[PDB]
DNA sequence: AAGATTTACGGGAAATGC
DNA sequence: TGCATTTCCCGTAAATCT
């Protein structure tokens, strides 16, 4: 999966450890005639035309000495700057995109969610900074023993070691990342959305694979750490975080050695205009200090938005929430969004819809299904707007409720009564009346589809069949689901006077795709209400 | 509801009055009297700087009869102490004794005769009584204080006579501190002495001294396992804590009759973390105390609950209450914590009883002794003197069902409540009995005479029914079954074909048809016959 | 008042103790 | 191990806030 940008990053920062490894070569070259330079000095004073030789070479030791400073020094700058501009790729650039993708991955898209070769590549740059920091020390050290006027060690080192120390300092903070976003055990479909009282897990790592910190640092978690207008909106609840809020950081598991905490069993309480709970916004923020190698470091990070319920019922109008935060911002910490939340178009909405069939289970929606919904946002497809206020803010038009309530519960309908039945291919589910119509129309009679319906709150499914003049029944509710699954009903379905329909629609015939899903001493029993 | 026993109580109580009121007005004669014979005896001595002879005589004659007066008041004061002393043990260890015992059978659903107000009229009458005869014995110390002699029985009387009626002001103040509603969850109305961790129980307690200075004076503090883990007490028993607000204040409040209460409502226990019987056999206590200071003494007033099972889980609720259902039957012993190490027999009268409480207290009607009796043959098999054993009954699976007597009793008591409460105790439901007898239908009655009974082969519940041909019946619908259709629909509901009278001769329609009851299609299910 | 939000708590499930 | 007991937490209902 690598890029063109990709490769030369990794190029760029092999040849940084070349360059290291070149400069580290030049230092014991002269480190030793500097140690040969000061035996001769010291001879000749303890010896107190042949002795003037020896003055003689002493002077050109003297000046290549000086000569490989000059030239180390220049190196040591030209590093720096390759450094200095290789690591804003890595941390605003690629990280950056893995950030993105985390937001995208939450949602239910393309998982490209791991770190490794990140992590790779940042360790390798912090290993040739830290080395390149011994290498500017070591010059230090030289210095404080043989010095002169003009010479260069005494007029560069300092801003060598300054800009060596910021650079090292700024990976370290970028490399303290979230890498699981806070999340419910219980509903891992839907992070960043926690219930107070019920437990949510998150996960934190540092991406400089240093094993010297191995359960070096505590990282202490917490919520609204900000809040009580630090940065702004005064009116919304704040929380606490109860169980045990700090925790070790360590190479444990062994997934690869990786250096990461992560944090089980937390819950949330309660401390006790604006935005309903559901669009309120708050982040769960990480924080610890590194000491390392003479520097005092201290990182942070956080979470992104989460949405904070109290009843589980609140959580479909919740995700909504987290869907089109994530679908629209690459910001990580915007909790008034929700003031005037962004406005998303038809292809942004729809992919993330099928998203949500599309990893709650095996396929999405296919694109003539998927725009009968199209239909029911507007009227009779790729710049058309959505808004919030469209989409989950308000009821549509003149039903009791939201386009996305309804919507999820069909979600919810699929994993609790029909899973297998739903991406079988099975179900065509959403189509418009009129649409719907060209069945009988093209087909013999017996020919059926399967939909949902719109008729009402959670959900309800549905089916075509004839005497034509087209037919179907009422909606059988999910506390009347449990006792007989759709498919069984399906087949079971007759109209004791008895008789039902033939093929799915195209041409398939009924018992091949719904047979499969299909099932003194008192009497056995089991049943159909089927017509009147 | 008064009794012949109540009505002498009732009878000595008002003597006492009369007694204390008699010696009230004989103290203010004999305090005129001790007033005039100062008053003289003042101005005789005034005189000292015939007549002067007849006065010496007076204030003689005035101190004898003086004298006279205290030994007949403190007589009768000691005559009155014997008497309260020994009407106090009717009241409290007789009548309020058996107060508390049929506050047991209530809590089980007996007759609930709980009412405290007779009982708190007599104590406080016979308190009232009381503060007023040791006020007339500290006048008479204060008599003694100011006039003196040898021979004087306030001198050689008063003491014991405070003493006997300190003691019994102070244990009628101890008595009288009472459970007045036992530790319950709001939610589980009729299974008292029950408490499932984290949600919230309510418990009151009253002082039948009703007295209003001490309106806003008492503080009560709730608590459990107190003086547990060793006083007596059995080794490796969990342990709880009582969360929320653990004392209370006593008031007259919301004027019921104005009795002093402290009502602890939103308790909640939690198991103090950190082997001799099942959690749902162990019996802790709660505990409530508080100390009064009223007219120089200090009395620490002290009670308890009843023996509470304490689970965590709500499916633990129906072997637990068997165990309160065993306990309060069989004992009247407030604090016996170890009784089911070596738990009681029980005859089959006393458990029958309570068994019909169980139906006679969540709906309508009990159990008629003929239905019932079907249970009774399923105990032991083919009444009066038998004896059950709490094996027998709860702790030990019936042979051959992997399931209790009792925990399958409780689901159909369950099952009567959730789906069919109207349908049973109307007589609709024999519901009980054996098939041998069960027969005894269409050998006397005509094709169609059907009968209501409940299913032996299950845990939880399920509802049966005969149908003639083949005499047939059907696999007992769930409860999750349920859900959807009621019992008499689906007995309704039911090339199809069903039956026609409920045993003995009514028809079907008129018992059961009462609780019976483009666009798509409207439909509703029979799964009938098939 | 009605609408929002949170608390209460059964019951099945899973985890933990023993 | 299997069995006993407790924790977990949805989902409806009721209570509370606004």
Known sequence: ???????????????????VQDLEQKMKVVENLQDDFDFNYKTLKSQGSVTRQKMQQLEQMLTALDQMRRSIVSELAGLLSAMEYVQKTLTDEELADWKRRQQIACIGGPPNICLDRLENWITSLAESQLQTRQQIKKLEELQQKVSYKGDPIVQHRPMLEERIVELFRNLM??????????????????????????????????????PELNYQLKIKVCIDKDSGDVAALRGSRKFNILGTNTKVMNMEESNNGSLSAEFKHLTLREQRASLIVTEELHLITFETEVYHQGLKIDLETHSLPVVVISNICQMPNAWASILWYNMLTNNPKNVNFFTKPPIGTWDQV???????????????????????????????????????????????????????????????????????????????????????????????PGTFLLRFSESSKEGGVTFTWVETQIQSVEPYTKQQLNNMSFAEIIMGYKIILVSPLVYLYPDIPKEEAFGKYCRAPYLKTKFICVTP
């Open 1 to 19: 999966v690598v890029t063109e940008k990709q490769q030369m990053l990794e190029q760029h920062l092999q040849d940084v450890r070349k360059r």
């Open 173 to 210: 903070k970028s490399a303290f990342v979230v890498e699981r976003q806070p999340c419910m055990p219980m509903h891992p479909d839907r992070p960043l959305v926690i219930k107070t009282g019920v437990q949510f897990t998150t996960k934190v790592r540092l991406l400089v694979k240093f």
């Open 350 to 444: 729809a992919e993330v819809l099928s998203w949500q069939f599309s990893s709650t289970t095996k396929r999405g929606l296919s694109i003539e299904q998927l725009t009968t919904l199209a239909e029911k946002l507007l009227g009779p497809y790729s710049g058309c707007q959505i808004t919030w206020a469209k989409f989950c803010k308000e009821n549509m038009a003149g039903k009791g409720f939201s386009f996305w309530v309804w919507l999820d519960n069909i979600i919810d309908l699929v994993k609790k009564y029909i899973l297998a039945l739903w991406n079988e291919g099975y179900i065509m589910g959403f189509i418009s009346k009129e649409r719907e119509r060209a069945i009988l129309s093209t087909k013999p």
